[PDB]
Sequence to fold (1361 residues):
Amino acid sequence: MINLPSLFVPLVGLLFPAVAMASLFLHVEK
Amino acid sequence: WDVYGSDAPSPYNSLQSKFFETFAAPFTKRGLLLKFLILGGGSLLTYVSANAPQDVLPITRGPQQPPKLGPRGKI
Amino acid sequence: LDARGSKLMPDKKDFGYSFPCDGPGRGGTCDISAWDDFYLAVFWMLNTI
Amino acid sequence: ELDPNTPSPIFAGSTGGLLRKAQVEEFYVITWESPKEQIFEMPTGGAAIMREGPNLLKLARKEQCLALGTRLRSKYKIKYQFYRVFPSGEVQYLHPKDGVYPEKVNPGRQGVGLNMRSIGKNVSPIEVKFTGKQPYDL
Amino acid sequence: PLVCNSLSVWAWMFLFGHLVWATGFMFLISWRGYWQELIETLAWAHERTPLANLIRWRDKPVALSIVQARLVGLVHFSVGYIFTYAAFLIASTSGKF
Amino acid sequence: FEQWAKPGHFSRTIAKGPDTTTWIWNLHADAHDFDSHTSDLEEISRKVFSAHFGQLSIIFLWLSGMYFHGARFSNYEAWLNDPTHIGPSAQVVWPIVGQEILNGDVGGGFRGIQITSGFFQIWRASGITSELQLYCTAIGALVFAGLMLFAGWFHYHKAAPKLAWFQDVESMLNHHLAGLLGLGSLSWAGHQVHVSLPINQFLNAGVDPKEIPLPHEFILNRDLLAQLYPSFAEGATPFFTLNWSKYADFLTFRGGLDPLTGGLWLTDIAHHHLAIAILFLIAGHMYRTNWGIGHGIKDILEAHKGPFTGQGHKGLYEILTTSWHAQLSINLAMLGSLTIVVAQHMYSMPPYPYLATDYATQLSLFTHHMWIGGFLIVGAAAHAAIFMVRDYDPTTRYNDLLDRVLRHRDAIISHLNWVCIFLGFHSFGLYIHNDTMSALGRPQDMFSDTAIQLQPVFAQWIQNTHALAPGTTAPGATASTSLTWGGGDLVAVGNKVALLPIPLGTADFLVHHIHAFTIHVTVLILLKGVLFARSSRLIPDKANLGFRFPCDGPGRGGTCQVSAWDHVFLGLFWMYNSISVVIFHFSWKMQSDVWGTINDQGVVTHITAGNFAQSSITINGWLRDFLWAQASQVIQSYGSSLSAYGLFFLGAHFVWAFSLMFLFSGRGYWQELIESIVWAHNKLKVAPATQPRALSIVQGRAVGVTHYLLGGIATTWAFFLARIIAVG
Amino acid sequence: KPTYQVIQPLNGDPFIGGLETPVTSSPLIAWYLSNLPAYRTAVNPLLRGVEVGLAHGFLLVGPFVKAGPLRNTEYAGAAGSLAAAGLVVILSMCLTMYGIASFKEGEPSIAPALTLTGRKKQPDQLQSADGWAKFTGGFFFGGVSGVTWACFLMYVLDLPYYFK
Amino acid sequence: SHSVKIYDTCIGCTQCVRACPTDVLEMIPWGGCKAKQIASAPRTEDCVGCKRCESACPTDFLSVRVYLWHETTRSMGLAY
Ligand SMILES: CC1=C(/C=C/C(C)=C/C=C/C(C)=C\C=C\C=C(C)\C=C\C=C(C)\C=C\C2=C(C)CCCC2(C)C)C(C)(C)CCC1
Ligand SMILES: CC1=C(/C=C/C(C)=C\C=C/C(C)=C/C=C/C=C(C)/C=C/C=C(C)\C=C\C2=C(C)CCCC2(C)C)C(C)(C)CCC1
Ligand SMILES: CC1=C(C/C=C(\C)CCC[C@H](C)CCC[C@@H](C)CCCC(C)C)C(=O)c2ccccc2C1=O
Ligand SMILES: CC1=C(C/C=C(\C)CCC[C@H](C)CCC[C@@H](C)CCCC(C)C)C(=O)c2ccccc2C1=O
Ligand code: SF4
Ligand code: SF4
Ligand code: SF4
Fold:
């Protein structure tokens, strides 16, 4: 059912880069 | 005769090698299995705190005080 | 232009475009990239904007 | 607690030169004979009591050495020596490997001395487009 | 000191441009071999102090090529400077026209 | 003899059969200095009080102006009589091209530019009165420069003079105390009682103008002062043996201040200046000299030891005796706050009559009198350097307390470095929040007074106690030691306000922790660069480049700004950021929340609002309401007499500006240039031979320093000014 | 008892600049830095830092309430350990992305032999991958509970720190 | 790892290149100048754009600089 699209923003700011500074942490230890 | 010490400072910690340990545990850990609880970890609150109404907000409804989305005009 | 070589260091030709400054070298050298003239260039232009 | 160590070098405990984590990726040592305990200026600060040996003391930036060899130039003093020294010991030293004094000049000292450009001829240097084998370098 | 109404932002962004400008300054006026030297004298302190001792760090903290230390002078700056006038030229006009 | 130049002077290679412009600021940039002179004291001691000379002959050359250009064109008389409304003026200016309006015409029958910084208030303080008078003291002090500048020629010249009895240091350190303070303090009392006290007490109502008891009186015969505060004035002074109690009358610890016009009591300033007068007369004999009474010179200091802190603080230097540089930090950090001390003091609790109410100098003054202080200390210990890289000889030290530091570097500096994040980084990083929390951040809940409150509060502190302090506890004195602190026991005068219970709180353990910050990461800059400076853990050997010395390696991947000379080249900037802060906090307290006006129903009315409290929390609040809420003063302010402050920070903003061009810029870039043009002259044969090279690195970390650092000052003095006066 | 190791630095060769004073090694109970994972050379993760976790979690019941958002409010006095678990779980990652300054893949460990083990050269690299990461099973297991144990129990205070 | 390229004539010294910090200095004997001497680096691996190596070192056109690209914990200097 309904209410959102917040789905995106807690990503694009919250986990996504949490995963940027995560997997290229790296680039070094990529 | 031995001016001691510590040096060897206090009993080698409690009969506690058990339950915490092993049991539960998110554990084994890294490389593979880490994401395994930092994937939920970060899609948890997120995901489910990228909703739950209806509701909980800061709160405000029914645009009036000399009407509004008007005037007046219409519905 | 003359950042082709100069005569200060008549060989930035080798050196290139993007060499970070110089050091005390015969008190008479510093920030010297033809790059770091684009640096300064991008100052006066945002001035001229 | 206490001993081995027989330095002198000496001034005791402070931070400001030679630390914890470079018993690995290099280390560097220095030898000489010490005219008197004849105290002088010695990095972290102190003043060191020179002694009747030594002269062997630890210090990582071999930077610090010649400096100190010549540091030993404002009380009169002479013949600095250094070494390396690391896991597991070996090099790393110009005085003496033969103490060739960088100045002098003497025996057989090698090539590696300079561009087919006796410089003036300097310009746009386009003898390059993806050199391979071709220069990497000179 | 009452509220925000609808021109709230640059009232933030602007002082942003008015910060984010500004500190494209340290990098700029504050050149190079003052950073290492210092960032040693404690790249060091946190190499001694127990409990947070077992932490040796994957590579090894240095200060910044002098170029850079003129670049990020340029993209804090301009970014600041692209900012504000940026937010002003807009702010301005939604009040007055 | 001798002399004269001509090429070559002291920078060994000066003449050089020249070759290039840029010597004319190697000389202009060596010239005074030493070692690029010599510590050979028998020709350097005999420069320092040579001096040291003129500076006075200049200070004289000074003051002898500030009465001629007082008493050749008063506002002094044409006002004095009437403090209150109608105020200062010491310059009126020739009628060239529209100078005029610059000399206002607003001072009581006087055309002229209005004047900020007491003086009127400094000379209505003693008494003097009559222009033909401290004009009879304009001449008192101008030749009176002469002879003091006739000391250059006195010694040195026909008299190569003495280090033998310069080096020693006991007569002078005793006599300054006694000697030439002690000719003073109390021999201002004879003045402050007889001259000063009553030509004020009887000013304090009647005595309007011209019949003004020319000080001429009140010597040999009393009767009149006698007719005033008594003392029984026969020819026998009681307190020769303890009738003290009587010759008192007019000097019991009165504290507060003269409510018939602020200042504070002259009935409260002989007891202050014959006690702190004579300690300095007696306590200015404690050292050796000749006659077997005295102390260690240094023989005291090595007196004591301590295990760690070892030897103690021992055998305290022997150039500390010798010469300047070694010494030269201490007479400055000291003198340092000894101009931030008198500052946070003066406004803080008024001297000479007519301040508290005033403004345009219960501010103005306040500053400068804090620049000089900041300036002075925040460039005092660039003398710790030089010294090590200089005046320090072979040895005197190891196991000295000194070395105990130079060892314990890296891990003394260091543990400041962090405070200097926490303290700041996050305690300034703290208006920020409440911006992100006023814009974004809904009063709902954040860091201000009815906010991150903090209810009663913040106290008080203490101060307050400073207000039970005179009613018991230090038995008396009078009225609460300085109205600024205390409870609600509240005064003023002159319609407008004077000083009152200036209550703190949030807005107060805020800000502060910035001066509280700053003067952390403004020292250690300083200490980092004061300790490493000669031995730096990363070019380890410095005394191998000089004091200034640019940087060094493009190697080690980026060695620059290593010198303390350049640790000082930004040692400053911040001060300016720190002195040229702090002033600020001040001028929005005094005002908005201290200055007043009067009306009546219980209601003081400030220059601006009790705003501040919650519209100077958030960082911003200081441009909302500290700029465009002000500046109006100066923004419009043309065609008038604010017509200079509409004319300064203009060419003060440029010349904050025309810094970065020399300071952000390159240096090789510029030299690289001054050919190109060269072709024009040369080919067309004109061209120099002092080969016109382009300004030496250091030299241009010797301008965007001055220039920046001329720039954002005047500016703020072009500014803060004209605020005060009409909404002043 | 007879004075002590003062002046003459850091043990050994008067030139190894870590440093010795009190707050290095001392009677007044350096003892600390030696029963939480601190010094010793010690033993075996989990039961070293499941202590950190255990302790480290509730340590934040603080700046998770009057500080931040809602001081005291609805939803509510769940203060103590809100997302305070939530805003661990990266603190509970972070050092599980650390695993680069520790590598091996197994833990013997554990006794020691005779002989000795924790062999005469520790200060440094004993610890490993699948050699440290089960300390990480601690702090996190410990974090939560380190959080959660401050919730279920108590919240109109009591005499807990009095000193100590 | 030291750069770029740097050039002939001087030595002897007694008034030129006598002061690299991190060594990087022999002096071969070689035949050309007014007694015998050609040089840059019997080394360049200890150095370090210690670029004080021409300040003491004349002879005409660029004469010392750095180019470390790789730039190395040997001569990026940072030990600890
Ligand atoms: C071309 C020409 C010219 C022009 C000029 C001009 C146009 C100028 C301007 C400029 C600008 C555009 C700016 C500037 C300004 C100035 C200034 C700015 C000055 C200063 C100063 C001073 C000396 C001061 C001091 C002080 C103090 C004491 C402290 C406080 C503050 C103050 C500032 C007050 C001339 C005439 C030369 C000649 C001919 C031609
Ligand atoms: C004991 C100890 C210690 C201590 C330390 C201290 C004392 C402090 C610190 C502190 C700190 C360190 C603080 C901080 C904290 C934090 C907080 C209070 C919160 C926050 C934040 C942040 C940072 C974030 C943001 C976010 C989130 C959280 C989510 C996601 C994303 C975002 C962005 C939204 C030492 C050093 C000795 C070492 C170790 C042990
Ligand atoms: C502050 C400063 C430093 C020190 C630089 C430091 C301490 C950098 C430390 C990293 C900071 C803490 C990072 C903050 C922002 C970055 C993470 C942003 C880039 C991230 C994306 C590209 C991923 C210099 O080394 C320097 C050198 C020459 C001239 C001026 C300066 C200078 O001003
Ligand atoms: C412009 C500039 C120069 C060149 C500036 C110079 C050479 C100063 C000019 C000196 C004076 C003004 C000579 C000009 C002529 C005057 C003496 C008087 C003639 C003009 C009238 C008053 C008659 C540098 O050397 C430099 C160095 C390092 C960083 C930045 C810079 C920089 O920005
Ligand atoms: S010449 Fe300038 S930028 Fe280059 S290394 Fe030296 S001070 Fe640094
Ligand atoms: S670098 Fe110095 S020593 Fe070598 S040839 Fe040139 S001038 Fe001579
Ligand atoms: S970079 Fe220059 S100073 Fe450093 S070793 Fe090489 S030639 Fe010598």
In short: The interface with chain D takes residues 395, 397-398, 403, 405-411, 535, 537, 540-541 of chain F (CB under 8 Å). The first strand of chain F starts at residue 275 and ends at 279.
